[PDB]
Coordinates of C-alpha atoms and ligand atoms in Angstrom, one line a residue:
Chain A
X84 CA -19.5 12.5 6.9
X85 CA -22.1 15.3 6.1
X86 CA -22.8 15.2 2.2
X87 CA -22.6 18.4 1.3
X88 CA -23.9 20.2 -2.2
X89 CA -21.7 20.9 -5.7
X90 CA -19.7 23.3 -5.9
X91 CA -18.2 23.7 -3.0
X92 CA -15.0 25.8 -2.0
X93 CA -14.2 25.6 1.5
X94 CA -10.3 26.0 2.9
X95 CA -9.3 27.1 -0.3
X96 CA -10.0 24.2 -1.9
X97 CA -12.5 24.7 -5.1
X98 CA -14.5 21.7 -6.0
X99 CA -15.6 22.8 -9.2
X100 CA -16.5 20.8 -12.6
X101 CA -15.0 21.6 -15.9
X102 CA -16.0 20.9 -19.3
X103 CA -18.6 18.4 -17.4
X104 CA -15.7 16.7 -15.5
X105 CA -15.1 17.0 -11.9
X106 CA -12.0 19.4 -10.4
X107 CA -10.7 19.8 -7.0
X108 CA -8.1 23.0 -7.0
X109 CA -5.3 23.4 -4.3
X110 CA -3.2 26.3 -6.4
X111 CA -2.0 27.6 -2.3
X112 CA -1.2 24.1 -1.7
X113 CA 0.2 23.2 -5.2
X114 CA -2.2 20.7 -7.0
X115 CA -5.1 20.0 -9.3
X116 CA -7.2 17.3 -9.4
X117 CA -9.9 15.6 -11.1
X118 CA -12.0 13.1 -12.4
X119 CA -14.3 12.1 -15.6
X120 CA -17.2 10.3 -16.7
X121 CA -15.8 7.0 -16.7
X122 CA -13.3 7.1 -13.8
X123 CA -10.1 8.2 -14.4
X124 CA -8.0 9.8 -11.6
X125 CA -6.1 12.8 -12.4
X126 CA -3.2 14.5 -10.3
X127 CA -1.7 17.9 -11.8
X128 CA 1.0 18.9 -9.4
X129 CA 3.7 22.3 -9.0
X130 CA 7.4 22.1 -9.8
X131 CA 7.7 22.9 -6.0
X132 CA 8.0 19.0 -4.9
X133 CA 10.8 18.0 -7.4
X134 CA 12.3 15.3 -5.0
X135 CA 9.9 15.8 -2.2
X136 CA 6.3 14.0 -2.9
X137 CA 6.8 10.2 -2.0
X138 CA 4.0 8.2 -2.7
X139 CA 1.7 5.9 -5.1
X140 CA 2.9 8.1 -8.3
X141 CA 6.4 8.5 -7.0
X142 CA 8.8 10.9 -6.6
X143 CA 8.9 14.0 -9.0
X144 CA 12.3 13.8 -9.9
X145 CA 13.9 13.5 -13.7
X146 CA 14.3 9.7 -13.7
X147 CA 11.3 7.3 -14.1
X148 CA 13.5 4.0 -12.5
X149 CA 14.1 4.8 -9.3
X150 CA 10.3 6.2 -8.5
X151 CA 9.8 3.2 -6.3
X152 CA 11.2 4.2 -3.5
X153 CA 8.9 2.4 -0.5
X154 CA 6.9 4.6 2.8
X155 CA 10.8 3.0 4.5
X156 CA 12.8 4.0 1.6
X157 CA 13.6 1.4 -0.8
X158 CA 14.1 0.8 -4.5
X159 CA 12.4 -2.3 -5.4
X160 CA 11.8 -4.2 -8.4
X161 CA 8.2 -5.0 -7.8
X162 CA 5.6 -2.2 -9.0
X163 CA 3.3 -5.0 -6.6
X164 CA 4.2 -4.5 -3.1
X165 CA 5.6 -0.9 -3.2
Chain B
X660 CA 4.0 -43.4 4.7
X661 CA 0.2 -43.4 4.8
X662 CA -0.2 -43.6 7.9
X663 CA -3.1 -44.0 10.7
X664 CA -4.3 -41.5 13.5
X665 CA -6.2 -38.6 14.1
X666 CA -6.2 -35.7 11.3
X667 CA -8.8 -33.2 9.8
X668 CA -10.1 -32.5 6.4
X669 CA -7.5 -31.3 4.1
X670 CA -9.1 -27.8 4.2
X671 CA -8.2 -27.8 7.8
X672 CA -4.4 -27.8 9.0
X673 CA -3.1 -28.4 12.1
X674 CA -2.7 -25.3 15.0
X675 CA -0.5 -25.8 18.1
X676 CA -3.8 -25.2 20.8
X677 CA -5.2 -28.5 19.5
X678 CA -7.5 -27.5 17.3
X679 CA -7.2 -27.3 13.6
X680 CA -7.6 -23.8 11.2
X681 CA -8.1 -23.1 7.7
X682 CA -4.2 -21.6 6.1
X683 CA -6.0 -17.9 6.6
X684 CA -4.4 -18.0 10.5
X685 CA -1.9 -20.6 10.3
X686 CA 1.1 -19.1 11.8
X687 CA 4.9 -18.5 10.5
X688 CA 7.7 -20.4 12.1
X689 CA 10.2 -18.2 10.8
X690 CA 14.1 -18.8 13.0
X691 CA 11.6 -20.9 15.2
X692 CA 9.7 -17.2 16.5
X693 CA 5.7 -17.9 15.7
X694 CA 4.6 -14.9 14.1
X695 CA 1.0 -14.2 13.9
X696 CA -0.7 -14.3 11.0
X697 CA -0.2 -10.5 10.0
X698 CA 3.2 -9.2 11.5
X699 CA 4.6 -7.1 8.9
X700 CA 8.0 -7.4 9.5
X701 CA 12.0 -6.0 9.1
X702 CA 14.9 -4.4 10.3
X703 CA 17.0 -1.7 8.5
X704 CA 18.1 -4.0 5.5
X705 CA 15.6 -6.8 5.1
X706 CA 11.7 -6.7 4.6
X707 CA 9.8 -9.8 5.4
X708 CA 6.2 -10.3 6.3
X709 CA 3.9 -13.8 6.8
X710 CA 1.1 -14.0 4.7
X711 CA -1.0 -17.2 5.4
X712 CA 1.9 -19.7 6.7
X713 CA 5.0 -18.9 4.5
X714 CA 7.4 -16.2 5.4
X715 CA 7.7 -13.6 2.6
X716 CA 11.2 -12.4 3.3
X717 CA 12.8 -9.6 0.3
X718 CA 15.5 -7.7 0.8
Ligands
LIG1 C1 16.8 14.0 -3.8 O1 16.9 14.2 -2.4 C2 17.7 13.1 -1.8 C3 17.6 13.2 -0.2 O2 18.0 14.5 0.1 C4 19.1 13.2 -2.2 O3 19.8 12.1 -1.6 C5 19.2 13.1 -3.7 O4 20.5 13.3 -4.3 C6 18.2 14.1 -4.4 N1 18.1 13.8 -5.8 C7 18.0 14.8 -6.8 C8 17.8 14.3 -8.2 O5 18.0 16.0 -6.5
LIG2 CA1 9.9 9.5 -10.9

């Protein structure tokens, strides 16, 4: 809750801005994110979750189908509720 | 029929304690069992929750 100052790179996690963007680097814990001027959330991620990450951008596997696969386990037809 | 008694402006339906609600906490009557109204909702198979009076069953 403390607002703290830019940049910032506590618990190996740079918070950093590039090319006048916004960044947040994980490289030890396998992602990159980032934002820009208008809004527009950005998720790099490491080959090392193929088939593990399950979430709102579902699974990183080959397929793009089956990536709706609910917080139970479920493939549903509705990109809604999931 | 159009019938006679006591009822309760249309934005109002009926609750079981006597009073009358608005459909945001008007239970489910889902296999008879009155489900509040947020009780997400399954077994292994099925997935069913009630939203504001109907029961939202998938599968
Ligand atoms: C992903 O992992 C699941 C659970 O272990 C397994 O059932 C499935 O075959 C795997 N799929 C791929 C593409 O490796
Ligand atoms: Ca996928």
């Amino acid at each position: 809750d403390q607002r703290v100052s830019m940049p910032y790179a506590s618990k190996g996690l740079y918070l950093e801005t590039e090319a006048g963007y916004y960044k947040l680097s994980g490289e030890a814990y396998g992602f990159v994110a980032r934002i820009d001027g208008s809004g527009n959330f950005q998720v790099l991620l490491s080959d090392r979750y193929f088939n593990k990450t399950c979430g709102l951008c579902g699974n990183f596997n080959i397929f793009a189908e089956d990536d709706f696969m609910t917080q139970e386990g479920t493939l549903t037809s509705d990109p809604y509720d999931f | 029929a159009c019938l006679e008694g006591c009822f309760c402006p249309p934005g109002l339906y009926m609750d079981e304690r006597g009073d009358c609600v608005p459909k945001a906490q008007c239970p489910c009557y889902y296999d008879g069992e009155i489900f509040q109204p947020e009780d997400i909702f399954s077994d292994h198979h099925t997935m069913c929750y009630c939203e504001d009076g109907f029961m939202h069953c998938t599968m």
